[PDB]
């Protein structure tokens, strides 16, 4: 594989480029937060008398 791409330098470039634009496009649509969900989920029951 290294020998393969030593002979085919632009093929190696397009793999790198395709990976890179996939990544660029990913950034445009990725959510942003301080944290992911890390708190355990809670449910509250409220009643009144």
């Amino acid at each position: 594989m290294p020998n393969f791409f030593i002979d085919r330098p632009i093929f190696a470039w397009v793999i790198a480029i395709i990976i890179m634009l996939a990544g660029g496009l990913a950034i445009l649509k990725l959510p942003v937060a301080q944290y992911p969900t890390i708190a355990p989920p809670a449910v509250t029951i409220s009643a009144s008398y």
Binding site: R8, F11, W13, V14, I18, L21
Partner: protein
């Protein structure tokens, strides 16, 4: 539709870009992919003309149909150029002259491919009865596109190759190597 409903352009542009990159990988060249990609309008013109003359619309069935045509028009053009390049590198033959040999060592397979597909989408275009609206729609786009894509490319793909090869140099070949 206030919910951002127009993404086709950028998606077609991304798709166009990845096609060029993939083609670059295939031929190990940055320039040669252009000779394959110039075939794209040759198929689009047919779809527009067909949809126009049958009063169809640019809708879902128009967009999926044209990618189909572009896919197969690409595939035709690719195996022309595939031959032309391999006749220049393996056989070592000159530019114009390896184009010719390349050109239709593949006509017969290209006319097989295309005409068999064209007569294959024909049940869609001549479809009457339930759902024929969608069948008629998706059918005339592909058919018109493929008909023009192949009759036109078979004269323009030979041109695309040679024009690109000259603008993007290598001033110590053309004419007759061996090795």
């Amino acid at each position: 539709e206030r919910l951002s409903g127009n993404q086709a352009p950028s998606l077609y542009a991304i798709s166009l870009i990845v096609v060029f990159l993939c083609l670059a990988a295939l031929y190990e060249s940055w320039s040669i992919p252009f000779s394959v990609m110039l075939v794209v309008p040759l198929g689009v013109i047919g779809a527009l003309l067909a949809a126009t003359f049958r009063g169809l619309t640019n809708d879902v069935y128009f967009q999926v149909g044209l990618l189909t045509t572009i896919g197969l028009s690409a595939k035709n053009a690719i195996l022309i150029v595939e031959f032309a390049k391999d006749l220049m590198d393996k056989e070592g033959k000159g530019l114009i002259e390896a184009t010719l040999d390349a050109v239709r060592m593949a006509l017969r397979p290209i006319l097989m491919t295309s005409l068999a597909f064209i007569l294959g989408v024909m049940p869609l275009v001549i479809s009457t009865g339930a759902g024929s609206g969608a069948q008629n729609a998706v059918g005339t786009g592909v058919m018109g596109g493929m008909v023009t894509a192949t009759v036109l490319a078979i004269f323009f793909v030979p041109v695309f190759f040679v024009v690109v090869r000259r603008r993007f140099s290598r001033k110590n070949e053309d004419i007759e190597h061996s090795h």
